[PDB]
Symmetry: C4
């Protein structure tokens, strides 16, 4: 992983060696969001021949910390039911069981668990369900 721009400075030695000129690098930067080399702090040529860009502070976008937004819960959703069939492994991974499903089926007026095309569990959300009815609509 060679560094083609270090601390805002074009590194001509490794550009030659990695066989990329200016026109090519400029084009690779624009596909990553940086429209001039003046806005770039770090640029790294990768294995697959892609460029990774760390923009200079002033041109970067603000993170959650920078805007003092309180640290929030970040979690993946879990697919409980797919195509009318309950997914086995995903029940215990979400720490739920078939009792919880049927209680939540009745909470949204659903009759069997094969009436449901798709259902997903999210930590900070109600249970999401797409019925076979809802999918013709």
């Amino acid at each position: 992983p060679n560094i083609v721009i270090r601390k805002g400075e074009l590194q001509y030695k490794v550009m030659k060696k990695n066989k990329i000129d200016i026109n090519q690098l400029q084009s690779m930067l624009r596909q990553a969001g940086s429209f001039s080399i003046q806005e770039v702090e770090y640029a790294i040529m990768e294995t697959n021949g892609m460029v990774s860009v760390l923009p200079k502070s002033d041109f970067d976008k603000p993170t959650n910390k920078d805007m003092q937004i309180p640290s929030k819960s970040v979690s993946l959703p879990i697919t409980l039911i797919i195509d009318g069939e309950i997914v086995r492994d995903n029940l215990k991974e979400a720490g739920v069981d078939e009792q919880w499903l049927k209680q939540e089926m009745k909470k949204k007026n659903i009759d069997k668990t094969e009436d449901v095309l798709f259902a997903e569990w999210h930590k900070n959300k109600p249970l999401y369900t797409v019925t076979y009815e809802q999918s013709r609509s």
Copy 2:
């Protein structure tokens, strides 16, 4: 879908199986915007070969809800006229007729619809027209 980073931890067992080392993963995370493993809550090795990154809260970017921005209408534009010809089904999608177009043509000094290279309808925007004369003017 194999999880190569779970709750901030390198899953070394799934990295051996999928044949990706540390230096490959870091490169892959860089391409998705994360410049250190320490900034990643979740990384998912997709079946097409790429990784998908969920960053830790502190290194993610604020959403509209986080900045208490009001819920906007989110909708797609619809092409009404393309290459001089009015599109059939796209008028109905817009909830609009050929009557409405000619009134809006007169709103931008346009005689016929065949003087129009491109016309686009959007829910929260005035109608957008590019004439054939505008195509050559630029």
Copy 3:
């Protein structure tokens, strides 16, 4: 342009016709940064197989207008010098001339026009130069 999610709703007839099931869609959405289908208002299967994603308002990112930042000028920079030689076409497109260039080279202690490896113009701004010197230091 196939609309695979419309107004938050999974369009099951369109997915089946385009030969993508729920796990594949999810994976494609994640590549576009959306980690759950509940966070998506529109998803569009492009002709080259990629999925374009419009997040629901609350999960999308603030624009400049949303943050009530006043409109600023947006302008592409133009490369005027590459590898010692001044590009002829890029001079008359940006607006400037060689009279302007050589005056600007005098501003930064540059002697001849062949001393410069890279120079870019930005609007009404101070000209950016990278001399052959700086490249190896």
Copy 4:
């Protein structure tokens, strides 16, 4: 590198030259985040068939400068231990030594350097260290 949209205006002569129609351009813009042509100030048809997009001021995302977040420091992490073996060059680049390393080991309750699968030095963070024992968990 061809400019297909300049100052919000489609360049139809350039589009016909490059053999791209409206539909094809729109799809390209959608993959770059732009969901209408009206939100684009500049679009650049790039050498490898991708499009680069500068959105109009109102539709672009705010930078740190726009938000008056002060200039924070931008840097890359440096890996110090990988697969049990300490990287030679990486200690010198980070401005530390095995003297500093082994004192950091005792701060994190690890005895020898071979117990560590991965360790990275970040300029504005405490030393990251992943032992085999929490590799096993």
